[PDB]
Structure 1
Amino acid sequence: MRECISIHVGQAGVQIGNACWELYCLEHGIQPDGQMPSDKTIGGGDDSFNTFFSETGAGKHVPRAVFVDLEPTVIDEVRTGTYRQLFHPEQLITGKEDAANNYARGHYTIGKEIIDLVLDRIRKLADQCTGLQGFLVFHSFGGGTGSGFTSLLMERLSVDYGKKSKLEFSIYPAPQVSTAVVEPYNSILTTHTTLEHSDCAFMVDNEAIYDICRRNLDIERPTYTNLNRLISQIVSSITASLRFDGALNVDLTEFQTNLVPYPRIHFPLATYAPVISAEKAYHEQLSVAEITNACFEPANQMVKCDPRHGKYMACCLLYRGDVVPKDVNAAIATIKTKRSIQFVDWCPTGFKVGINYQPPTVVPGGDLAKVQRAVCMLSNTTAIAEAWARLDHKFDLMYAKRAFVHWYVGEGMEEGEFSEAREDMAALEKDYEEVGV
């Protein structure tokens, strides 16, 4: 095949991964025990879902997935839950002591004790691949493991797999749903040390997902399960091209080609429509024009920012369901004629379109209504720099006083790395300013 390996790091990455692979199984007709009746290949196989699932001799389809946490609580739930039999048991890896919300513990003092086991286990999955194309890495920005161990892992994967692509799904922190005061520090530290090792990173702003659950799904106090089922719906939209036959983003390399013009500004914005509550099961069905228009409302964005205040460098539309191509083209034309969406002058001012004609799946247990057609727009807009600016400002307020810095210096890290990371973020913000003005 051309296989892809998914890596989940820390609580957020593990729990989001749980929801993603639950959804994947339902989309592909795979039972929790790995069995798949629909398509009958004895073993191995070379179908499109094989990029994400290996096959044993007994007809078991096993995720090409690794879950890592520095403490066992969250992964122990995977080992005892509905999908306990789905994953490779050796690909669920835990230590006894977490990073205590400290990037330096995740990267240095605590992460060093488990990094070599994680890499040897990743190597075992890689060795079962006839044509590994790279990795999808799920993690939080604010966690000590999600930030520190992910950056350490990404560093080692670049040495060990120099030619392979690495894609990130990264949870950007929100005050409404937070766990630590030091999350701005960890977010800036990991972005700095991972920037050169990641080819494309899809940020998920926990505040944006929180807003959507409250307004679109009428959930007053969203749980992590609520957030994650919505996140997984959007991740599945982005990875479906890797798991089904298609003509857009058919391998990890093509993500960079279509979405990342310059290696450092590799943070596309995701917008997903429609998001409808499961209690509105008999809702009128929205047209292609309507769901496409909804992709340019800020209320449906995964990161809070204003693309009208920015310029576009790339724009992909990934439709799912009952979507006629001519209706897409008419809808695109309406967007360019009536909307003031500005592309930079050096990129093709066109929209790339992929259509998967299978209706979107919704998990039984979820808060999302079945829809006949949906769309995820991936766009590289300079406006996402607003999100970096919000993080940098929270960092600056605390760092100006050196608040909490001693916890990092006490865990194998030099104070000089704070300013190095911050100046790299300053240079990233200037990169966005130079591209769009």
Structure 2
Amino acid sequence: MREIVHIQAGQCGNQIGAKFWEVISDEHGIDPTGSYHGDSDLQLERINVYYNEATGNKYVPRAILVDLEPGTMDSVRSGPFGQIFRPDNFVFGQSGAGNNWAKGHYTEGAELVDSVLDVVRKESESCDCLQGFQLTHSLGGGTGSGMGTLLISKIREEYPDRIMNTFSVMPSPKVSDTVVEPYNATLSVHQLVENTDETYCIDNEALYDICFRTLKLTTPTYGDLNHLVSATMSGVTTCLRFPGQLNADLRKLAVNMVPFPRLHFFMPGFAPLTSRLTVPELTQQMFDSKNMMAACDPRHGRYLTVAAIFRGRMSMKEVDEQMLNVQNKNSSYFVEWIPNNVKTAVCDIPPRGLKMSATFIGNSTAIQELFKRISEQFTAMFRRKAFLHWYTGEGMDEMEFTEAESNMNDLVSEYQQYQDATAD
């Protein structure tokens, strides 16, 4: 009844977006043709959150695929579940963005944005009660970073009373050698802090470090990183997709997770992280720095709010005891002026391949470590005005780079403020 509209923009956005749909389709018992062959009615209880129902009991993802490059469309379309998507929901240009945020936001993407919006409107018009939108994209590119933030602003114009959620992929020199990624990222964050209600920070730096150090993969591929992302995205949307009490919709999540409107950048976490458990162990790991999908140490800041999601058949008594154990033993890392800020949900349905897992969503002031890293890479190039001509060539001004830098620095300060805050 409460429908979410999915949007995936750019190469990264579509890649992780596709994997996301593959994973939950399996969980809900949907096949690539859109037919249901499942074993539990819990799968279809809240299927209308992500799936439209068509003739012949076919389930179609309420998904919109976007890119200024037509290559992405074919790859998805000829993918495993490529035939599940709605053909008319494919929207694409030809010229590409070429890692230029200005092209995606003001020039090339601005030409294409209207045709995307038309598809959004058609999906939303058919919603019994649209709760909001979720976007998958990267902040390092130009389409996902530039056109994605544009789409957000335009969608917010027509649905200002709906929740805007984003799965933003952060750039890292360890995965990508494109040097202007700190420019594109900072310019994107400048938009996200103003026009999104809740942003999951997917850090490629953290995805790489996990694959290399923990999973012990010498040369991690984009497919190795996305395996983590899909497992995370499946976890943080568990409460939305299955019958439950806690954070069952996007707005209730936002109310529990966002104490101040700007501070809505979450640090997701997952457990177990494994490639070729007890409830206490699950709980330990999900709060471990080695299990965070953002390159931040939570012990270098304080938790404003936390949403924990346990999946699988287990003892809820044990979960309740352990979650209390963590908060008491690590009370210094939870702000005291927000009582009972850690909420816990338990879903009986485990993800594919696992007996039981744990998904963590934290609003930590330690997220500033992530923004500080980008700011350091950004300023190193901006102080010398490097590669700026490609952006100003599209009509941008230098002052817009200044403002984005400043606003991002402000966000950091604000996280530090509430980190240093006390009750007395």
- Give the alignment's TM-score, normalised by structure 1: 0.93
Please point out which of 220, 223, 227 is paired with 2:221. Answer: 223
For the 8 Å contact 2:45–2:243, the answer to whether it is kept is no
Q: Kindly provide the amino acid, as one letter, of the partner of residue 346 in structure 2.
A: I
* Further displaced range: 24-33 or 77-86: 77-86
In the alignment, the residues of structure 1 paired with residue 315 and residue 395 of structure 2 have an alpha-carbon distance, to the nearest angstrom, of 57
Residue 219 of structure 1: CA displacement?
2.0
More off after superposition, 76-85 vs 298-307: 76-85
Which of the residues 383, 408, 416 maps onto 1:433?
416
Deviation of residue 206 (structure 1)? 0.5
Mark the runs of 5 or more structure 2 residues left unpaired by the alignment.
none
- AA aligned opposite 1:424: N
Give deviations 1:266-320, integer Å, cap 9, x for gaps.
011111110122x3xxxxxx10110101122111110111111211111111011
**Paired amino acid for 2:182:** P
Task: Identify the residue that residue 321 of structure 2 maps to in structure 1.
Answer: 330
Residue in structure 2 matched with residue 208 of structure 1 by the alignment:
206
- 1:107–1:152: 8 Å Cα contact kept in structure 2? yes
Is 1:384 aligned to 2:384, yes or no?
no
**Residue 101 of structure 1: aligned partner:** 99
- Alignment partner, residue 303 of structure 2: 312
**What do residues 17-55 of structure 1 show as CA deviations (whole Å, max 9, x unaligned)?**
0100000110000010001133899xxx98301110011
Partner of 1:297: 288
Segment of structure 1 superposing worse, 333-342 or 147-156: 333-342
Which residue is equivalent to 2:386?
403
Q: Where do residues 114-153 of structure 1 align in structure 2 (5 Å cutoff)?
A: 114-153=112-151
Tell me by how many angstroms 1:350 deviates: 4.3
Write out per-residue CA displacement over residues 327-353 of structure 1, whole angstroms, 9 at most, x where no aligned residue.
Answer: 111112321333354222321144211
1:32 alignment counterpart: 32
Specify which of 331, 345, 359 is matched with residue 350 of structure 2.
359
Aligned counterpart in structure 1 of residue 77 of structure 2, from 76, 79, 82: 79
For 2:402, what is the secondary structure of its paired residue? Answer: helix
1:219-258 matches, cutoff 5 A: 219-258=217-256
Q: Residue 11 of structure 1: SS of its match in structure 2?
A: helix
Aligned to 1:55: 53
Aligned residue pairs total 419
Residues 327, 334 of structure 2: 8 Å contact kept: no
Q: Secondary structure at the match of 2:35?
A: coil
Q: Secondary structure at the match of 1:67?
A: strand
C-alpha distance in 2 between matches for 1:184 and 1:166: 23
Aligned to 1:283: none
How big is each residue's C-alpha offset from its partner over 1:362-405, in whole Å with a ceiling of 9 and x where there is no partner? Answer: xxxxxxxx321110111111001011111011111110001111
Cα distance in 2, alignment partners of residues 206 and 76 from structure 1: 25
Distance 1:326 1:400, change over 3 A: same
Determine if contact 1:312/1:341 at 8 Å carries over to the other structure.
no
Given the alignment of the two structures, is residue 342 of structure 1 paired with residue 333 of structure 2, yes or no?
Answer: yes
Calculate the aligned-residue CA RMSD, in Å: 1.6
1:218 Cα shift?
A: 2.9
Structure 2 distance, partners of 1:123, 1:353, is 35
CA distance in 2 between partners of 1:344 and 1:84 (Å): 45
Contact 1:308 1:341 in 2 (8 A): no
Q: Counterpart in 1 of 2:170? A: 172
- CA displacement, residues 126-149 of structure 1 (integer Å, 9 cap, x when unaligned): 111110000001110100111110
Q: Is the 8 A contact 2:28 2:44 kept in 1?
A: no
Is the Cα contact below 8 Å between 1:320 and 1:374 reproduced in 2? yes
Partner amino acid, structure 1, of 2:221: T
Is the 2:107–2:394 contact (alpha carbons within 8 Å) kept by the matching residues of 1? yes
Question: Which region of structure 1 is more displaced relative to structure 2, 204-213 or 130-139?
Answer: 204-213
Larger displacement relative to structure 2 (262-271 or 209-218): 209-218
Given that 2:236 and 2:360 are in contact with CA atoms closer than 8 Å, whether structure 1 keeps it comes out as no
CA distance in 2, matches of 1:350, 1:253: 16
- For the Cα contact (< 8 Å) 1:343–1:349, is it kept in 2? no
Supply the distance in 1 between the matched residues of 2:289 and 2:40 (Cα, whole angstroms). Answer: 44
Residue number in structure 2 paired with 1:3 = 3
SS at match of 2:265: coil
- How far off is 1:170 after superposition? 0.5
| Residue from 156, 165, 171 that aligns with 2:154 | 156
Distance in structure 1 (CA, Å) of the matches to 2:206 and 2:391: 29
Q: Trace 1:254-293 onto structure 2 (pairs within 5 A).
A: 254-277=252-275, 279=276, 286-293=277-284
Percent identical: 42
1:321 has 2:304 as partner? no
Q: Give structure 1 regions of 4+ aligned residues with deviation exceeding 6 angstroms.
A: none
Q: TM-score with structure 2 length normalisation?
A: 0.96
Amino acid at match of 1:127: E
Inter-partner Cα distance in structure 2 for 1:199 and 1:169: 12
User: Could you tell me how far apart the structure 1 residues matched to 2:47 and 2:359 are?
Assistant: 20
Moved more, 345-354 or 236-245: 345-354
| Stretch deviating more after TM superposition (348-357 or 3-12) | 348-357
